[PDB]
Design a binder for these strands. Structure first.
Ligand SMILES: *C(=O)[C@H](CCSC)NC=O
Ligand SMILES: [Mg+2]
Ligand SMILES: [Mg+2]
Ligand SMILES: [Mg+2]
Ligand SMILES: [Mg+2]
Ligand SMILES: [Mg+2]
Ligand SMILES: [Mg+2]
Ligand SMILES: [Mg+2]
Ligand SMILES: [Mg+2]
Ligand SMILES: [Mg+2]
Ligand SMILES: [Mg+2]
Ligand SMILES: [Mg+2]
Ligand SMILES: [Mg+2]
Ligand SMILES: [Mg+2]
Ligand SMILES: [Mg+2]
Ligand SMILES: [Mg+2]
Ligand SMILES: [Mg+2]
Ligand SMILES: [Mg+2]
Ligand SMILES: [Mg+2]
Ligand SMILES: [Mg+2]
Ligand SMILES: [Mg+2]
Ligand SMILES: [Mg+2]
Ligand SMILES: [Mg+2]
Ligand SMILES: [Mg+2]
Ligand SMILES: [Mg+2]
Ligand SMILES: [Mg+2]
Ligand SMILES: [Mg+2]
Ligand SMILES: [Mg+2]
Ligand SMILES: [Mg+2]
Ligand SMILES: [Mg+2]
Ligand SMILES: [Mg+2]
Ligand SMILES: [Mg+2]
Ligand SMILES: [Mg+2]
Ligand SMILES: [Mg+2]
Ligand SMILES: [Mg+2]
Ligand SMILES: [Mg+2]
Ligand SMILES: [Mg+2]
Ligand SMILES: [Mg+2]
Ligand SMILES: [Mg+2]
Ligand SMILES: [Mg+2]
Ligand SMILES: [Mg+2]
Ligand SMILES: [Mg+2]
Ligand SMILES: [Mg+2]
Ligand SMILES: [Mg+2]
Ligand SMILES: [Mg+2]
Ligand SMILES: [Mg+2]
Ligand SMILES: [Mg+2]
Ligand SMILES: [Mg+2]
Ligand SMILES: [Mg+2]
Ligand SMILES: [Mg+2]
Ligand SMILES: [Mg+2]
Ligand SMILES: [Mg+2]
Ligand SMILES: [Mg+2]
Ligand SMILES: [Mg+2]
Ligand SMILES: [Mg+2]
Ligand SMILES: [Mg+2]
Ligand SMILES: [Mg+2]
Ligand SMILES: [Mg+2]
Ligand SMILES: [Mg+2]
Ligand SMILES: [Mg+2]
Ligand SMILES: [Mg+2]
Ligand SMILES: [Mg+2]
Ligand SMILES: [Mg+2]
Ligand SMILES: [Mg+2]
Ligand SMILES: [Mg+2]
Ligand SMILES: [Mg+2]
Ligand SMILES: [Mg+2]
Ligand SMILES: [Mg+2]
Ligand SMILES: [Mg+2]
Ligand SMILES: [Mg+2]
Ligand SMILES: [Mg+2]
Ligand SMILES: [Mg+2]
Ligand SMILES: [Mg+2]
Ligand SMILES: [Mg+2]
Ligand SMILES: [Mg+2]
Ligand SMILES: [Mg+2]
Ligand SMILES: [Mg+2]
Ligand SMILES: [Mg+2]
Ligand SMILES: [Mg+2]
Ligand SMILES: [Mg+2]
Ligand SMILES: [Mg+2]
Ligand SMILES: [Mg+2]
Ligand SMILES: [Mg+2]
Ligand SMILES: [Mg+2]
Ligand SMILES: [Mg+2]
Ligand SMILES: [Mg+2]
Ligand SMILES: [Mg+2]
Ligand SMILES: [Mg+2]
Ligand SMILES: [Mg+2]
Ligand SMILES: [Mg+2]
Ligand SMILES: [Mg+2]
Ligand SMILES: [Mg+2]
Ligand SMILES: [Mg+2]
Ligand SMILES: [Mg+2]
Ligand SMILES: [Mg+2]
Ligand SMILES: [Mg+2]
Ligand SMILES: [Mg+2]
Ligand SMILES: [Mg+2]
Ligand SMILES: [Mg+2]
Ligand SMILES: [Mg+2]
Ligand SMILES: [Mg+2]
Ligand SMILES: [Mg+2]
Ligand SMILES: [Mg+2]
Ligand SMILES: [Mg+2]
Ligand SMILES: [Mg+2]
Ligand SMILES: [Mg+2]
Ligand SMILES: [Mg+2]
Ligand SMILES: [Mg+2]
Ligand SMILES: [Mg+2]
Ligand SMILES: [Mg+2]
Ligand SMILES: [Mg+2]
Ligand SMILES: [Mg+2]
Ligand SMILES: [Mg+2]
Ligand SMILES: [Mg+2]
Ligand SMILES: [Mg+2]
Ligand SMILES: [Mg+2]
Ligand SMILES: [Mg+2]
Ligand SMILES: [Mg+2]
Ligand SMILES: [Mg+2]
Ligand SMILES: [Mg+2]
Ligand SMILES: [Mg+2]
Ligand SMILES: [Mg+2]
Ligand SMILES: [Mg+2]
Ligand SMILES: [Mg+2]
Ligand SMILES: [Mg+2]
Ligand SMILES: [Mg+2]
Ligand SMILES: [Mg+2]
Ligand SMILES: [Mg+2]
Ligand SMILES: [Mg+2]
Ligand SMILES: [Mg+2]
Ligand SMILES: [Mg+2]
Ligand SMILES: [Mg+2]
Ligand SMILES: [Mg+2]
Ligand SMILES: [Mg+2]
Ligand SMILES: [Mg+2]
Ligand SMILES: [Mg+2]
Ligand SMILES: [Mg+2]
Ligand SMILES: [Mg+2]
Ligand SMILES: [Mg+2]
Ligand SMILES: [Mg+2]
Ligand SMILES: [Mg+2]
Ligand SMILES: [Mg+2]
Ligand SMILES: [Mg+2]
Ligand SMILES: [Mg+2]
Ligand SMILES: [Mg+2]
Ligand SMILES: [Mg+2]
Ligand SMILES: [Mg+2]
Ligand SMILES: [Mg+2]
Ligand SMILES: [Mg+2]
Ligand SMILES: [Mg+2]
Ligand SMILES: [Mg+2]
Ligand SMILES: [Mg+2]
Ligand SMILES: [Mg+2]
Ligand SMILES: [Mg+2]
Ligand SMILES: [Mg+2]
Ligand SMILES: [Mg+2]
Ligand SMILES: [Mg+2]
Ligand SMILES: [Mg+2]
Ligand SMILES: [Mg+2]
Ligand SMILES: [Mg+2]
Ligand SMILES: [Mg+2]
Ligand SMILES: [Mg+2]
Ligand SMILES: [Mg+2]
Ligand SMILES: [Mg+2]
Ligand SMILES: [Mg+2]
Ligand SMILES: [Mg+2]
Ligand SMILES: [Mg+2]
Ligand SMILES: [Mg+2]
Ligand SMILES: [Mg+2]
Ligand SMILES: [Mg+2]
Ligand SMILES: [Mg+2]
Ligand SMILES: [Mg+2]
Ligand SMILES: [Mg+2]
Ligand SMILES: [Mg+2]
Ligand SMILES: [Mg+2]
Ligand SMILES: [Mg+2]
Ligand SMILES: [Mg+2]
Ligand SMILES: [Mg+2]
Ligand SMILES: [Mg+2]
Ligand SMILES: [Mg+2]
Ligand SMILES: [Mg+2]
Ligand SMILES: [Mg+2]
Ligand SMILES: [Mg+2]
Ligand SMILES: [Mg+2]
Ligand SMILES: [Mg+2]
Ligand SMILES: [Mg+2]
Ligand SMILES: [Mg+2]
Ligand SMILES: [Mg+2]
Ligand SMILES: [Mg+2]
Ligand SMILES: [Mg+2]
Ligand SMILES: [Mg+2]
Ligand SMILES: [Mg+2]
Ligand SMILES: [Mg+2]
Ligand SMILES: [Mg+2]
Ligand SMILES: [Mg+2]
Ligand SMILES: [Mg+2]
Ligand SMILES: [Mg+2]
Ligand SMILES: [Mg+2]
Ligand SMILES: [Mg+2]
Ligand SMILES: [Mg+2]
Ligand SMILES: [Mg+2]
Ligand SMILES: [Mg+2]
Ligand SMILES: [Mg+2]
Ligand SMILES: [Mg+2]
Ligand SMILES: [Mg+2]
Ligand SMILES: [Mg+2]
Ligand SMILES: [Mg+2]
Ligand SMILES: [Mg+2]
Ligand SMILES: [Mg+2]
Ligand SMILES: [Mg+2]
Ligand SMILES: [Mg+2]
Ligand SMILES: [Mg+2]
Ligand SMILES: [Mg+2]
Ligand SMILES: [Mg+2]
Ligand SMILES: [Mg+2]
Ligand SMILES: [Mg+2]
Ligand SMILES: [Mg+2]
Ligand SMILES: [Mg+2]
Ligand SMILES: [Mg+2]
Ligand SMILES: [Mg+2]
Ligand SMILES: [Mg+2]
Ligand SMILES: [Mg+2]
Ligand SMILES: [Mg+2]
Ligand SMILES: [Mg+2]
Ligand SMILES: [Mg+2]
Ligand SMILES: [Mg+2]
Ligand SMILES: [Mg+2]
Ligand SMILES: [Mg+2]
Ligand SMILES: [Mg+2]
Ligand SMILES: [Mg+2]
Ligand SMILES: [Mg+2]
Ligand SMILES: [Mg+2]
Ligand SMILES: [Mg+2]
Ligand SMILES: [Mg+2]
Ligand SMILES: [Mg+2]
Ligand SMILES: [Mg+2]
Ligand SMILES: [Mg+2]
Ligand SMILES: [Mg+2]
Ligand SMILES: [Mg+2]
Ligand SMILES: [Mg+2]
Ligand SMILES: [Mg+2]
Ligand SMILES: [Mg+2]
Ligand SMILES: [Mg+2]
Ligand SMILES: [Mg+2]
Ligand SMILES: [Mg+2]
Ligand SMILES: [Mg+2]
Ligand SMILES: [Mg+2]
Ligand SMILES: [Mg+2]
Ligand SMILES: [Mg+2]
Ligand SMILES: [Mg+2]
Ligand SMILES: [Mg+2]
Ligand SMILES: [Mg+2]
Ligand SMILES: [Mg+2]
Ligand SMILES: [Mg+2]
Ligand SMILES: [Mg+2]
Ligand SMILES: [Mg+2]
Ligand SMILES: [Mg+2]
Ligand SMILES: [Mg+2]
Ligand SMILES: [Mg+2]
Ligand SMILES: [Mg+2]
Ligand SMILES: [Mg+2]
Ligand SMILES: [Mg+2]
Ligand SMILES: [Mg+2]
Ligand SMILES: [Mg+2]
Ligand SMILES: [Mg+2]
Ligand SMILES: [Mg+2]
Ligand SMILES: [Mg+2]
Ligand SMILES: [Mg+2]
Ligand SMILES: [Mg+2]
Ligand SMILES: [Mg+2]
Ligand SMILES: [Mg+2]
Ligand SMILES: [Mg+2]
Ligand SMILES: [Mg+2]
Ligand SMILES: [Mg+2]
Ligand SMILES: [Mg+2]
Ligand SMILES: [Mg+2]
Ligand SMILES: [Mg+2]
Ligand SMILES: [Mg+2]
Ligand SMILES: [Mg+2]
Ligand SMILES: [Mg+2]
Ligand SMILES: [Mg+2]
Ligand SMILES: [Zn+2]
Lengths: 99, 53, 64
RNA sequence: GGGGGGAACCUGGGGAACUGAAACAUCUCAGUACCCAGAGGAGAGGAAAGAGAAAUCGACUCCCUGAGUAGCGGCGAGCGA
RNA sequence: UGGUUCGUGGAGCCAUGGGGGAAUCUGGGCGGACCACCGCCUAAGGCUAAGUACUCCGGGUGACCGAUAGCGCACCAGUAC
RNA sequence: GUAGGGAAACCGAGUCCGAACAGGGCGCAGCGGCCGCAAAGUCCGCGGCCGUGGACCCGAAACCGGGC
RNA sequence: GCUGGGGCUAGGAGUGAAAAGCUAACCGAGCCCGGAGAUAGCUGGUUCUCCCCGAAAUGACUUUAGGGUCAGCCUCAGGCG
RNA sequence: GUGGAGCCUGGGAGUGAGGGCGCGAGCGAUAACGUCCGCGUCCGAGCGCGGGAACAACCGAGACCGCCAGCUAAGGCCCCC
RNA sequence: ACCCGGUGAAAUUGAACUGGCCGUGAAGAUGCGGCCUACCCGUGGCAGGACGAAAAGACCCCGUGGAGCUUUACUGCAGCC
RNA sequence: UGAAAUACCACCCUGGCGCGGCUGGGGGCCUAACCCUCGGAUGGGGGGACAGCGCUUGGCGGGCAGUUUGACUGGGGCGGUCGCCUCCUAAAAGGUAACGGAGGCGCCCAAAGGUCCCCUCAGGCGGGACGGAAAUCCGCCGGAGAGCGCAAGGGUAGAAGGGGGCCUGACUGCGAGGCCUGCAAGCCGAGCAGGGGCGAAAGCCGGGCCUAGUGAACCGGUGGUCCCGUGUGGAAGGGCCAU
């Protein structure tokens, strides 16, 4: 409240899709985990394992991002960034896209 | 702006998109305005013609 | 009970990663025919709310 | 066999206003207060003409969470799965 | 018109005061206007423990009160007035 | 909490605007000898203040419901 | 005309040879209990001690003007130097 | 120039009725213990202390406590004193 | 009414050891200054003062307070077409 | 002789009726619903498919209901005022009040915009048919007292004034850095890219000598975009850009 005048907030304009009934469109969601967050794993990383380890959150598909250095692992992810694909490939890694 | 000095749009005569808003005095300038203006869609200078706002 | 998110702010405003508040520039909703391209163009960007108004808004968005 | 009673609780039939929106009418308060009918040791609900996206689940009730999310809103105050 | 988060909104769904008014599975309802496709379910009869609520009543226990406190009442109080 | 940017599709240490390899907005980043401390962050306690409730206490004139 | 006894009409309602009169000793809307701790940007009031610092009564906007929001001015913690 | 100076981040405010005086203007009547701004001051919050007979804001002066010690300030030094 | 025997209230009330003048003071002083005047305590009387008592001014203004009333204010509702 | 040859056939335009269909209106009568009535009631009389009543349409509607009915203000009312620009007050930086002293704005310009080229005023005196204080012409003087759309102020001919040619930068995408400032706004802006205008070129051009000519957000319209699209493809509806 601002003493009766139009407030700072109500004078800014709205922007963007706000949605409408019946609500949120159900669509697949992706969380990104970086190569740096994978160095603690030996062998084969999967969405199961990362969800356990407190990295990936439940109800999210797994996308590998490129911050960090790639370790020669068999990584099974729903999606990969371009940098994550180059780094992992050029390091003895096995990218396994899936659905 | 007024009743004799009206607001108007310039429509690119090639891709039919309105790129500019401007004004004229339709008593002094009854003819539709024709002005070469740069069209961002055609990415070239193009003839633009007055359409109604 | 728990705080409710002010939906007017949620629909106008974003809290950036470092905790600034960004909004759209006011003044290009209408009456634009005689505004230069510079005015239209610059009013099409986001800006950063002054600090006193940003703190008040962020309090209205407790679960962002 | 019914009638009438029972502190609260319950279901159904009706159903305000102050107040809040720093005025006010939509909105809020609230299907709350209260009136009435009925029930019982509980009452309601209940065995999909369901959910809703999972090629999935599998009556209903109740707690936690989902979530102040989705949305609803003089897109205001607020309301809210 | 009501119910739902849904205030007419693209407004479906559930309910129904008024008008019109079917079919019996190759029948019908739903998946948020509508249409196709693909699926889910079987309306217009009824019943159904438990887990849930409450505290007139009994008991147990308090980093509850201790006669201006604690129930309005420790006492012949819903009394005297 | 560990990723952000974008209305979004989406991309991602970037991203958005853009025709751009332009420019800009918003983002991105340990001390001492591998042991040790420390630190994101998060949990609980304590304290200040804020939001919702009567919300520091007492006070209207009034409005509404059901009765007398 | 006055008067006893027996009756009927009441709260946005009665009754009124009309005064907004009267409706149980205050009626421009009775009383009681309830919503209820209504709301009161107003007035009042706010309880032990010591120590350090220490304001303002301006600006902008405000159905604002004895009320607010931000800035100014006070204080505390951490940092800089 | 090391000061209860300054700058940065953050927690907590209060204030948003001022008033007197000096100087500078406006309004007023070269009126008001008038009114409205500007610079400054004091009272406000120093209604603690000395002087001005008495007396917030004029002169002197910023009260941590004690002393039956000394110097000064304004102002005083015939008596009240 | 007064005096004696019997019985014996009240509003009000910061405390009081409660004079006049001329000044001063928030602008009308028993309470400050200066001067004047004044032995202690009552009883019957009078009302000039204690800005005497009573009643949180009815006038007046202010509150985005209330209520009654009006209309070609707004928006509804009964009713009527 | 036709713009249009004539017979018959045909599809049709403007009409006119005859039949058939669905429709909708009025009028007359009937009785049996419904309503009223009748000492007699499965009946008689009257009204009559109207009226009443149900759902729905629009209308009149202080009879009643909820409310609104601004602020500033040398008390309130009445009057005046309310945003923006210019000058003064304003105490030679900026800022600075009163219901202090004076004015103006709510537009306008398709050139009154860009660039290149060229030109220089007002006024005074003298000369000149109609012709005047002032029309147009000539000479001399004349630094700006003219002009710059409109208030005022600043500025200005070493042009911002007057004339002409070609033009549309009255750009698209950005924007270092600042002015101002409580916020939000407002203002100035070099430079880079795209594609242009003018110029031989240097260069200039993102409207106008400058400061008034204005309105946050919500709600909705239109043109694009093709971003979302409630099982899926579409669509409905949104988003974004422009207005
Ligand atoms: C003026 O006469 C006033 C009237 C009071 S009652 C109308 N008197 C005192 O205020
Ligand atoms: Mg306003
Ligand atoms: Mg959303
Ligand atoms: Mg334009
Ligand atoms: Mg024009
Ligand atoms: Mg584009
Ligand atoms: Mg036109
Ligand atoms: Mg709640
Ligand atoms: Mg909103
Ligand atoms: Mg946003
Ligand atoms: Mg727009
Ligand atoms: Mg316009
Ligand atoms: Mg312009
Ligand atoms: Mg422009
Ligand atoms: Mg601009
Ligand atoms: Mg753009
Ligand atoms: Mg917060
Ligand atoms: Mg918060
Ligand atoms: Mg959350
Ligand atoms: Mg009974
Ligand atoms: Mg019973
Ligand atoms: Mg109940
Ligand atoms: Mg019910
Ligand atoms: Mg009920
Ligand atoms: Mg009712
Ligand atoms: Mg209400
Ligand atoms: Mg109300
Ligand atoms: Mg409330
Ligand atoms: Mg209110
Ligand atoms: Mg209020
Ligand atoms: Mg009100
Ligand atoms: Mg209300
Ligand atoms: Mg409501
Ligand atoms: Mg309530
Ligand atoms: Mg409700
Ligand atoms: Mg049980
Ligand atoms: Mg049961
Ligand atoms: Mg069955
Ligand atoms: Mg279920
Ligand atoms: Mg199955
Ligand atoms: Mg089954
Ligand atoms: Mg969650
Ligand atoms: Mg609400
Ligand atoms: Mg809601
Ligand atoms: Mg609702
Ligand atoms: Mg509700
Ligand atoms: Mg529900
Ligand atoms: Mg509905
Ligand atoms: Mg509902
Ligand atoms: Mg509804
Ligand atoms: Mg609906
Ligand atoms: Mg359907
Ligand atoms: Mg149905
Ligand atoms: Mg029905
Ligand atoms: Mg079937
Ligand atoms: Mg079928
Ligand atoms: Mg159905
Ligand atoms: Mg379904
Ligand atoms: Mg569907
Ligand atoms: Mg189903
Ligand atoms: Mg079944
Ligand atoms: Mg059923
Ligand atoms: Mg049962
Ligand atoms: Mg049960
Ligand atoms: Mg309990
Ligand atoms: Mg017990
Ligand atoms: Mg016991
Ligand atoms: Mg005890
Ligand atoms: Mg006792
Ligand atoms: Mg007791
Ligand atoms: Mg005792
Ligand atoms: Mg006690
Ligand atoms: Mg008891
Ligand atoms: Mg008691
Ligand atoms: Mg007892
Ligand atoms: Mg007794
Ligand atoms: Mg986002
Ligand atoms: Mg793009
Ligand atoms: Mg870039
Ligand atoms: Mg970048
Ligand atoms: Mg950067
Ligand atoms: Mg910690
Ligand atoms: Mg706080
Ligand atoms: Mg409460
Ligand atoms: Mg209270
Ligand atoms: Mg509190
Ligand atoms: Mg009311
Ligand atoms: Mg009322
Ligand atoms: Mg009643
Ligand atoms: Mg009675
Ligand atoms: Mg009688
Ligand atoms: Mg009689
Ligand atoms: Mg009698
Ligand atoms: Mg009687
Ligand atoms: Mg009667
Ligand atoms: Mg009666
Ligand atoms: Mg009443
Ligand atoms: Mg009543
Ligand atoms: Mg009446
Ligand atoms: Mg009489
Ligand atoms: Mg009584
Ligand atoms: Mg009584
Ligand atoms: Mg009486
Ligand atoms: Mg009376
Ligand atoms: Mg009276
Ligand atoms: Mg009343
Ligand atoms: Mg009433
Ligand atoms: Mg009353
Ligand atoms: Mg009475
Ligand atoms: Mg009584
Ligand atoms: Mg009661
Ligand atoms: Mg009750
Ligand atoms: Mg209540
Ligand atoms: Mg309360
Ligand atoms: Mg109260
Ligand atoms: Mg009120
Ligand atoms: Mg108040
Ligand atoms: Mg009090
Ligand atoms: Mg007090
Ligand atoms: Mg200190
Ligand atoms: Mg100090
Ligand atoms: Mg003031
Ligand atoms: Mg100040
Ligand atoms: Mg002020
Ligand atoms: Mg006011
Ligand atoms: Mg006032
Ligand atoms: Mg006022
Ligand atoms: Mg006061
Ligand atoms: Mg006030
Ligand atoms: Mg403040
Ligand atoms: Mg400071
Ligand atoms: Mg601070
Ligand atoms: Mg420090
Ligand atoms: Mg220091
Ligand atoms: Mg200091
Ligand atoms: Mg300091
Ligand atoms: Mg300081
Ligand atoms: Mg600071
Ligand atoms: Mg700070
Ligand atoms: Mg504090
Ligand atoms: Mg505190
Ligand atoms: Mg204050
Ligand atoms: Mg104020
Ligand atoms: Mg002052
Ligand atoms: Mg001062
Ligand atoms: Mg003043
Ligand atoms: Mg003064
Ligand atoms: Mg004085
Ligand atoms: Mg003076
Ligand atoms: Mg002097
Ligand atoms: Mg002046
Ligand atoms: Mg004189
Ligand atoms: Mg004065
Ligand atoms: Mg004076
Ligand atoms: Mg004076
Ligand atoms: Mg002063
Ligand atoms: Mg004070
Ligand atoms: Mg002093
Ligand atoms: Mg003093
Ligand atoms: Mg003093
Ligand atoms: Mg004082
Ligand atoms: Mg004194
Ligand atoms: Mg003294
Ligand atoms: Mg003194
Ligand atoms: Mg003295
Ligand atoms: Mg003196
Ligand atoms: Mg003095
Ligand atoms: Mg002094
Ligand atoms: Mg001196
Ligand atoms: Mg000291
Ligand atoms: Mg000292
Ligand atoms: Mg000496
Ligand atoms: Mg001396
Ligand atoms: Mg002397
Ligand atoms: Mg002497
Ligand atoms: Mg003496
Ligand atoms: Mg003496
Ligand atoms: Mg002596
Ligand atoms: Mg005697
Ligand atoms: Mg005696
Ligand atoms: Mg006696
Ligand atoms: Mg007494
Ligand atoms: Mg005393
Ligand atoms: Mg004494
Ligand atoms: Mg004496
Ligand atoms: Mg005495
Ligand atoms: Mg005496
Ligand atoms: Mg005086
Ligand atoms: Mg005196
Ligand atoms: Mg005396
Ligand atoms: Mg004394
Ligand atoms: Mg004295
Ligand atoms: Mg004395
Ligand atoms: Mg004396
Ligand atoms: Mg004396
Ligand atoms: Mg004397
Ligand atoms: Mg006597
Ligand atoms: Mg006497
Ligand atoms: Mg006497
Ligand atoms: Mg007397
Ligand atoms: Mg007497
Ligand atoms: Mg007297
Ligand atoms: Mg008095
Ligand atoms: Mg008197
Ligand atoms: Mg008195
Ligand atoms: Mg008194
Ligand atoms: Mg009172
Ligand atoms: Mg009073
Ligand atoms: Mg009174
Ligand atoms: Mg009166
Ligand atoms: Mg009055
Ligand atoms: Mg007054
Ligand atoms: Mg009043
Ligand atoms: Mg007010
Ligand atoms: Mg009022
Ligand atoms: Mg009323
Ligand atoms: Mg009333
Ligand atoms: Mg009604
Ligand atoms: Mg007939
Ligand atoms: Mg007939
Ligand atoms: Mg017949
Ligand atoms: Mg018949
Ligand atoms: Mg007949
Ligand atoms: Mg008959
Ligand atoms: Mg008959
Ligand atoms: Mg008949
Ligand atoms: Mg009919
Ligand atoms: Mg109809
Ligand atoms: Mg109607
Ligand atoms: Mg009316
Ligand atoms: Mg009325
Ligand atoms: Mg009527
Ligand atoms: Mg009435
Ligand atoms: Mg109004
Ligand atoms: Mg109003
Ligand atoms: Mg006023
Ligand atoms: Mg005033
Ligand atoms: Mg006046
Ligand atoms: Mg004045
Ligand atoms: Mg006066
Ligand atoms: Mg006055
Ligand atoms: Mg007037
Ligand atoms: Mg204003
Ligand atoms: Mg304006
Ligand atoms: Mg100046
Ligand atoms: Mg000046
Ligand atoms: Mg400045
Ligand atoms: Mg002032
Ligand atoms: Mg002037
Ligand atoms: Mg203007
Ligand atoms: Mg042109
Ligand atoms: Mg000449
Ligand atoms: Mg001549
Ligand atoms: Mg001549
Ligand atoms: Mg000039
Ligand atoms: Mg002119
Ligand atoms: Mg003019
Ligand atoms: Mg030309
Ligand atoms: Mg030219
Ligand atoms: Mg050309
Ligand atoms: Mg162009
Ligand atoms: Mg900048
Ligand atoms: Mg700014
Ligand atoms: Mg401007
Ligand atoms: Mg270029
Ligand atoms: Mg070029
Ligand atoms: Mg060229
Ligand atoms: Mg060139
Ligand atoms: Mg440029
Ligand atoms: Mg230009
Ligand atoms: Mg020009
Ligand atoms: Mg707007
Ligand atoms: Mg709105
Ligand atoms: Mg919109
Ligand atoms: Mg479109
Ligand atoms: Mg698509
Ligand atoms: Mg779909
Ligand atoms: Mg298809
Ligand atoms: Mg698709
Ligand atoms: Mg759209
Ligand atoms: Mg679209
Ligand atoms: Zn084009």
């Amino acid at each position: 409240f601002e003493g009766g005048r139009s407030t700072t907030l109500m004078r800014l304009p709205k922007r963007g899709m706000q949605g409408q009934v019946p609500g949120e469109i159900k669509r697949p969601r992706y969380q990104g985990v970086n190569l740096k967050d994978l160095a603690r794993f030996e062998g084969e990383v999967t969405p199961e394992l990362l969800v356990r380890a407190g990295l990936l959150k439940k109800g999210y598909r797994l996308k590998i991002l490129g911050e960090g250095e790639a370790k020669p692992l068999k990584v099974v992810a729903h999606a990969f960034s371009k940098s994550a694909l180059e780094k992992l490939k050029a390091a003895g890694g096995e990218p396994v896209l899936l659905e | 702006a007024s009743e004799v000095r009206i607001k108007l749009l310039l429509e690119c005569t090639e891709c039919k998109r309105r790129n500019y808003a401007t004004e004229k005095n339709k008593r002094n300038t009854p003819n539709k305005l024709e002005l070469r203006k740069y069209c961002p869609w055609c990415r070239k200078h193009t003839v633009h013609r007055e359409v109604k706002i | 009970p728990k705080m409710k998110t002010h939906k007017g702010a949620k629909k106008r405003v974003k809290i950036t990663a470092s905790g600034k508040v960004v909004a759209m520039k006011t003044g290009k909703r209408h009456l634009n025919w005689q505004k230069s391209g510079k005015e239209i163009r610059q009013k099409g960007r986001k800006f950063v709310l002054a600090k006193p108004e940003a703190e008040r808004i962020k309090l209205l968005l407790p679960y962002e």
